[PDB]
Write a protein that binds this ligand. Structure first.
Ligand SMILES: CCCCCCCCCCCCCCCCCC(=O)OC[C@H](COP(=O)([O-])OCC[N+](C)(C)C)OC(=O)CCCCCCCCCCCCCCCCC
Ligand SMILES: CC1=C(/C=C/C(C)=C/C=C/C(C)=C/C=C/C=C(C)/C=C/C=C(C)/C=C/C=C(C)/C=C/[C@H](O)C(C)(C)O)C(C)(C)C[C@H](O)C1
Ligand SMILES: CC1=C(/C=C/C(C)=C/C=C/C(C)=C/C=C/C=C(C)/C=C/C=C(C)/C=C/C=C(C)/C=C/[C@H](O)C(C)(C)O)C(C)(C)C[C@H](O)C1
Ligand SMILES: CC1=C(/C=C/C(C)=C/C=C/C(C)=C/C=C/C=C(C)/C=C/C=C(C)/C=C/C=C(C)/C=C/[C@H](O)C(C)(C)O)C(C)(C)C[C@H](O)C1
Ligand SMILES: CC1=C(/C=C/C(C)=C/C=C/C(C)=C/C=C/C=C(C)/C=C/C=C(C)/C=C/C=C(C)/C=C/[C@H](O)C(C)(C)O)C(C)(C)C[C@H](O)C1
Ligand SMILES: CC1=C(/C=C/C(C)=C/C=C/C(C)=C/C=C/C=C(C)/C=C/C=C(C)/C=C/C=C(C)/C=C/[C@H](O)C(C)(C)O)C(C)(C)C[C@H](O)C1
Ligand SMILES: CCCCCCCCCCCC(=O)OC[C@H](COP(=O)(O)OCC[N+](C)(C)C)OC(=O)CCCCCCCCCCC
Ligand SMILES: CCCCCCCCCCCC(=O)OC[C@H](COP(=O)(O)OCC[N+](C)(C)C)OC(=O)CCCCCCCCCCC
Ligand SMILES: CCCCCCCCCCCC(=O)OC[C@H](COP(=O)(O)OCC[N+](C)(C)C)OC(=O)CCCCCCCCCCC
Ligand SMILES: *C/C=C(C)/C=C/C=C(C)/C=C/C1=C(C)CCCC1(C)C
Ligand SMILES: *C/C=C(C)/C=C/C=C(C)/C=C/C1=C(C)CCCC1(C)C
Ligand SMILES: *C/C=C(C)/C=C/C=C(C)/C=C/C1=C(C)CCCC1(C)C
Ligand SMILES: *C/C=C(C)/C=C/C=C(C)/C=C/C1=C(C)CCCC1(C)C
Ligand SMILES: *C/C=C(C)/C=C/C=C(C)/C=C/C1=C(C)CCCC1(C)C
Ligand SMILES: CCCCCCCCCCCCCCCCCC
Ligand SMILES: CCCCCCCCCCCCCCCC
Ligand SMILES: CCCCCCCCCCCCCCCC
Ligand SMILES: CCCCCCCCCCCCCCCC
Ligand SMILES: CCCCCCCCCCCCCCCC
Ligand SMILES: CCCCCCCCCCCCCCCC
Ligand SMILES: CCCCCCCCCCCCCC
Ligand SMILES: CCCCCCCCCCCCCC
Ligand SMILES: CCCCCCCCCC
Ligand SMILES: [Cl-]
Ligand SMILES: [Cl-]
Ligand SMILES: [Cl-]
Ligand SMILES: [Cl-]
Ligand SMILES: [Cl-]
Ligand SMILES: [Cl-]
Ligand SMILES: [Cl-]
Ligand SMILES: [Cl-]
Ligand SMILES: [Cl-]
Lengths: 264, 264, 264, 264, 264
């Protein structure tokens, strides 16, 4: 009947509460980061301010999905005979997958803007990145419909998804290393750190996807929710702070005075 | 008893969850686009900033309807004997229909503004477009009261609704192709893309309306909710981003400096 | 036991759903109009910006009442043996009446500001209008406590309430027609349209009040909630848009540049 | 058992609904006033803008307490055998008392600012006022723990609380009448009105506190909720509007141009 | 079974209501402080405005955790046979612990900024403080898993957590006393008060942690929730107001005119 292994298990109070703690914190980090991005946007020059606005998109969108998951978790289970047990609703991770259709494009576009791509190059790269990402996400969603039924199918759609991932990482990595030299304000160093952050954070997702294949039980479910939390904070919030920092440094270097003031 | 076919079926966990995934994503994309429109409104010249404000209306209004539907979906059904089954509330789509009474005017007016219509021509066109749209929507709403009872009646009110649609598309298509030449900043190309986007996205709605007539079952329900989601994101959020992009390009061409800065 | 006739009936799914559709739309139109008023406030000169701020009050206040009513409607009734039937809470319209104590003053004050009244005249007129309005509202609230018990009493308190209405309409109509000539920017025409808008929209409320006296049944309840919806959108949102448009035209005429820019 | 007499009674539908009407209105007046304070803050000179900010604090804080109480009221009681009766939660007023620990300081500080106190005098007066207020509130809270058990104790802690009140009113009244002459823009008249508003509104609270001692029944409960509503609107929102009006008048008198514009 | 002693007891209506009063007040003080920080941020010079933005982070994040706890409290317990008793969900404090992973870094960084640290010194100190804090928090979280089972283990993980605390207090206290002399605008006095505020408020947390070890009963639970409330208001809101006041005084001293105006 069920699609996700979250819905197959009972949880101890400690497991159940840990997962609620993680989901609850995630919601407020995302909404808190939103206010911060709005306040510091005034120090970014207009030619880069879209990059900061794109972080605001991702914060609200991801914040509200987390908020839904956190409510669903407490609604789907009840404490009964010394364990939390499913009750009349089911819990799923598919909320995240569908949401990536909107947020992964935003994360990718904000990188292209601070790399200073422009015009045809900007629009071409953007298109290919967005199709590769939709490719990755849709095939991943279908795959994770088999996580209780058919691990074979999980792995096969996994592999296809991973093909798109690799193409997308290749485009990104190329544009970064080609454009690093033209970065302003000493941000060549910073953008390299961003590339590593992305390689680490983004790879947590396919690991979470494979948990059913290597840790099918309530401890795996705990692991998977922890991986998703770290990956959401790393890939969206911390990445966003680094993109905004790069935007401010380059704004100042280009002579925008609010940015120069913000830096002293 | 029931008015909509959503309320006639039981759903597998996978069908039921897919629909909740779609509804939930829609809510956050609309509220996220809101913040983006507020942040970039400062780069539009005042003569066009109403167009960007009208997008904020549409985002809030549509976002709150989606949020209602998404709550109603989880409230109307419960998982019971390995299927989701209705329980003591009913689910309906009429929330959307009534909401179009407000949002379709806003979408249409924001097009007229960036076409640079003014004065009598602006007010005349706006009036005729709004009456054509209210005509289309009211007749559609009555029609979809027959979707479980009387397909004949569904089709008849459909046909009347479609009459209004065609009138409305005719006015729009005329004003676009007449005014394309006077567009500034090379936006003659972009406005043409907008016209095709509208033709595709707006046409998804009458197709969703006909599903009871050609796929009366839970798979049709899934298809209809998918059609509404794509159509909402295409017709409101992506259309909104294209209107704002055109407004910025024309602002810069007219000599508004914040816009010129935003473009480099 | 019951005070309002809403609580006396069962509703078909179509009646019950139509009412929920109307309530839900009303909440979002009010909160959507709020964002619009904030964005265009920058085009109004400071001497008139209070008028636009007063619309923001009314939008938030009325939006939150509607939101309460919409939640109460779905909480008071459950679908049971093919009809919606009352369950353990009661539904009432008195939420609206008490909220008018705050909002009717705001609507009246925003008219006096754009009529360009000032000083003693402003403060005197404001006082008399606010007491007339409180007079109207309190007597109306008491009256509608008799809508199930005693139509006689309904009608008597009605008549007293209507006395205050007439006085209030008289003051307004006088100040409008006396001050229409001194309006700037060609807004003498516009303010006349506003006066008619008020005569139509405001009169829907006493009609809704009399429904128990001439249509005591679930169809009357449908009619009354539709009257309240149209009256709220007409009397608060569309009236708000007209007052703001008059404020912009007069600002421009007085030489405020943001207003001049906003109008080309 | 119970601490508050709210929890001792059953309520008629009319009594129960009237109280829900009052609580619901209070929430939206406070949130609506918030937007207005943010919009008109731009017309206050920076030297006084803290006063307007402090009203925003009080609006959010009091608005969210009201919102809690309004939800608890509908959650604590159910309609059963033609009356509302308590069910599995309890209703209490202590939410308000604890919230005054934050808001009474804010109300008092915003008065000191527009009286133009500065430096040592400002900080000394603020300290003594805050300790007097915490004294009043804590002793009041303890007192109202005896409203069902021991009226004797109610009255004794009342008397102590009233001692602090008197000290606090004395300090305020002194600083007002000593500083009235130095007020700018003709605000000596206005500040006197503020002092009377405070004397009336603030005194409603001790009267609501004594209702258990002189009207122990559901009609007393209705009276007490009405007194708290009037007192909240008078002491926070209307007082807020008067402090802001005085700040604008003195700003303009000091030569702040946005204020001069706002006044014509 | 249970992880936290909250879940072991029954509560009198007075105990249970006092705790709900504390949690409810906490939520609104944090959201109200948010609006205040946004409004006064315009008086801080851009070189210090990050400090004020960091308070906005902490207010949103902490406000939403409080809001969660406050809802859980009323959801976990029901009034039954004259006491509140647990029902089918469990209450825990771990929500706070996980949230500190985000907020303690923000509180620490906002101090470093107004101490005027810059560059290498800023980034080095920030890193060490954040690792010390994560050290303290993670060990604390594990420790408080033993509060019902094994006080021994509670104390052992306590001791390790306290080690990290001491290191972190040492770094802070050093940087304050080393940098106090270079503070502008007479803020050397103020920063010292901040250091004492932190020593008092921060120490309440380890005391709350030890309550299971010295007051295992419902009165201890009341004490612990009171300690957390005072500690949150002191350590986040009042600390926030002090850091912003120091930012404004130093801005004015550095010649920022908005700040000079804000101070007269
Ligand atoms: C936003 C929510 C509303 C506030 C919540 C509580 C209400 C007010 C609480 C007390 C006052 C707040 C602190 C003042 C703010 C900072 C003042 C400033 O600008 O600079 C500092 C000023 C400036 O100090 P200075 O060194 O410049 O010298 C004084 C200034 N001159 C020279 C001009 C006289 O110093 C102080 O006032 C120190 C403030 C110490 C704060 C101690 C309070 C902590 C303990 C309180 C526990 C209560 C918590 C629980 C209950 C609370 C109710 C919610
Ligand atoms: C889920 C799953 C599966 C997948 C699982 C997992 C964990 C998948 C993880 C995949 C990962 C981590 C992919 C990472 C890919 C990184 C790339 C492509 C990096 C490119 C980097 C470039 C192209 C730099 C280019 C640099 C340039 C051009 C400049 C370089 C030089 O620096 C310079 C020019 C400066 O000299 C399995 C189990 C496998 C199958 C199952 O069936 C399913
Ligand atoms: C639901 C339902 C029904 C409906 C179902 C469905 C799916 C209906 C869908 C209807 C559609 C897709 C309508 C789309 C209409 C597009 C129009 C009018 C486009 C105009 C475009 C202009 C007018 C350009 C004008 C351009 C001008 C004037 C200038 C052009 C040139 O550039 C030049 C400058 C040279 O003139 C049916 C089945 C019917 C009945 C059933 O029973 C129920
Ligand atoms: C509910 C209920 C009841 C009430 C029900 C209902 C539907 C009540 C509806 C009442 C209505 C529609 C009231 C409308 C009142 C309009 C007024 C006062 C208009 C003033 C207009 C001015 C003062 C212009 C002045 C113009 C001036 C001074 C100058 C004009 C010149 O042109 C110039 C330009 C030269 O100055 C009933 C059934 C009665 C009893 C039951 O028992 C209970
Ligand atoms: C609850 C309860 C109890 C109480 C319940 C209730 C309802 C209590 C009500 C208490 C009230 C209303 C207290 C009001 C206090 C007003 C004050 C201090 C006013 C100061 C005013 C100044 C200091 C002006 C000063 C003006 C000056 C210095 C100069 C003016 C000159 O004009 C100028 C300077 C201009 O020349 C009881 C029954 C008592 C016990 C029971 O057991 C429990
Ligand atoms: C929970 C628990 C446990 C813990 C419980 C509890 C309640 C723990 C509480 C711990 C506290 C309050 C620690 C406080 C630490 C303060 C520090 C390091 C302060 C440094 C201050 C500097 C370094 C200033 C330096 C100033 C300098 C260098 C100034 C220099 C000159 O003035 C200059 C010229 C530079 O200006 C126990 C019971 C232990 C175990 C159990 O088993 C579990
Ligand atoms: C993805 C969600 C958000 C998209 C953003 C919407 C734009 C609206 C606001 C514009 C503000 C502005 O100033 O626009 C300007 C910039 C671009 O021009 P420039 O940077 O000045 O280049 C300077 C050089 N020129 C003048 C020659 C151009 O806009 C963008 O980068 C627009 C986004 C383009 C990527 C779109 C990808 C298409 C995907 C197709 C796959 C299905
Ligand atoms: C109903 C919601 C009320 C909210 C209004 C108050 C907010 C104050 C913000 C200041 C903004 C501003 O610009 O203040 C000033 C404005 C305009 O007045 P003015 O410029 O002094 O007039 C011209 C003065 N000459 C002639 C010297 C140039 O004052 C108002 O419009 C005040 C509204 C009147 C209040 C009505 C009181 C009736 C109450 C009776 C109770 C039964
Ligand atoms: C038991 C606890 C008691 C402690 C009470 C503390 C009293 C408050 C101190 C005065 C603050 C004030 O309102 O204003 C603070 C100052 C006013 O300084 P000033 O004197 O005008 O400057 C002139 C200096 N001279 C006299 C030497 C010429 O303005 C500001 O820009 C500060 C901006 C706001 C900072 C945030 C603090 C606000 C907190 C309020 C929430 C309660
Ligand atoms: C905030 C959201 C982000 C950055 C999301 C990233 C998502 C991925 C990189 C997902 C990748 C997947 C694969 C490569 C294979 C397995 C299926 C996916 C979709 C989890
Ligand atoms: C954001 C919402 C939008 C743009 C809605 C568009 C809706 C339509 C164009 C609906 C058209 C209909 C017909 C042409 C026939 C059947 C009834 C309608 C109302 C669905
Ligand atoms: C946004 C709300 C508005 C403009 C409300 C207006 C309300 C009235 C004009 C109500 C009038 C009534 C009578 C004249 C008699 C019957 C009782 C009332 C209160 C419904
Ligand atoms: C918005 C909140 C305000 C202005 C609250 C004011 C509260 C009081 C003046 C409370 C006074 C009391 C006494 C003097 C005695 C009885 C107990 C109190 C606390 C109600
Ligand atoms: C707003 C949050 C703040 C300032 C949190 C502070 C937290 C601590 C100082 C926690 C310290 C702990 C110990 C020193 C030992 C016991 C375990 C902890 C985590 C409670
Ligand atoms: C058993 C009765 C079945 C019918 C239910 C009520 C009919 C409602 C039809 C109303 C017509 C559509 C109006 C839609 C526009 C809303 C205006 C704000
Ligand atoms: C008793 C069973 C509970 C299992 C979970 C305990 C995990 C402890 C790790 C603490 C990590 C806290 C910080 C979260 C990282 C974002
Ligand atoms: C807005 C775009 C939607 C995301 C696309 C997801 C792919 C959909 C394929 C799977 C549909 C599930 C149907 C039920 C499975 C048993
Ligand atoms: C500040 C809001 C007050 C305005 C409300 C009008 C007063 C209504 C009269 C009192 C009737 C309520 C008692 C219920 C008895 C059936
Ligand atoms: C932020 C501190 C809140 C203080 C609120 C008022 C003081 C509390 C009075 C003490 C009585 C508690 C009752 C305990 C249960 C019967
Ligand atoms: C001059 C350098 C300061 C000396 C360091 C003293 C640290 C003592 C910390 C004590 C913790 C309890 C704080 C009490 C709150 C007032
Ligand atoms: C020089 C660029 C090539 C590097 C290839 C990237 C592979 C990264 C694997 C992901 C795990 C590492 C996280 C730090
Ligand atoms: C100079 C004025 C003296 C103040 C006297 C205070 C008495 C307070 C009476 C109670 C307030 C009544 C509300 C209108
Ligand atoms: C604790 C309350 C009493 C404080 C009064 C201090 C002296 C006031 C003189 C202005
Ligand atoms: Cl720029
Ligand atoms: Cl996401
Ligand atoms: Cl313009
Ligand atoms: Cl819509
Ligand atoms: Cl003006
Ligand atoms: Cl209203
Ligand atoms: Cl100033
Ligand atoms: Cl309060
Ligand atoms: Cl600066």
């Amino acid at each position: 009947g069920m699609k996700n292994i979250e819905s197959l298990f009972d949880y101890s109070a400690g497991q159940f509460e840990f997962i609620d703690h993680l989901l609850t914190m995630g919601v407020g980090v995302h909404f808190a980061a939103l206010i911060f991005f709005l306040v510091v946007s005034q120090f970014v020059a207009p030619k880069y301010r879209i990059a900061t606005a794109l972080s605001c998109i991702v914060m609200v969108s991801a914040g509200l999905i987390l908020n839904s998951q956190a409510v669903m978790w407490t609604d789907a289970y009840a404490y009964v005979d010394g364990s939390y047990q499913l009750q009349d609703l089911t819990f799923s991770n598919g909320y995240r997958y569908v949401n990536w259709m909107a947020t992964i494009p935003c994360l990718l576009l904000q990188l292209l803007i601070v790399l200073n791509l422009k015009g045809k190059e900007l629009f071409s790269t953007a298109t290919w990145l967005i199709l590769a990402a939709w490719g990755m996400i849709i095939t991943g969603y279908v795959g994770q419909l088999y996580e209780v039924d058919d691990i074979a199918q999980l792995m096969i759609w996994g592999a296809v998804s991973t093909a798109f991932f690799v193409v997308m990482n290749w485009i990104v990595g190329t544009k970064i290393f080609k454009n690093r030299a033209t970065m302003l304000g000493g941000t060549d160093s910073t953008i390299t750190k961003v590339f590593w952050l992305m390689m680490f954070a983004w790879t947590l997702y396919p690991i979470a996807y494979l948990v059913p294949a290597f840790m099918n039980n309530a401890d795996g479910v705990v692991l998977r929710q922890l991986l998703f939390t770290i990956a959401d904070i790393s890939s969206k919030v911390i990445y966003g702070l680094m993109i905004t920092y790069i935007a401010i440094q380059q704004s100042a270097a280009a002579g925008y005075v609010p940015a120069q003031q913000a830096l002293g």
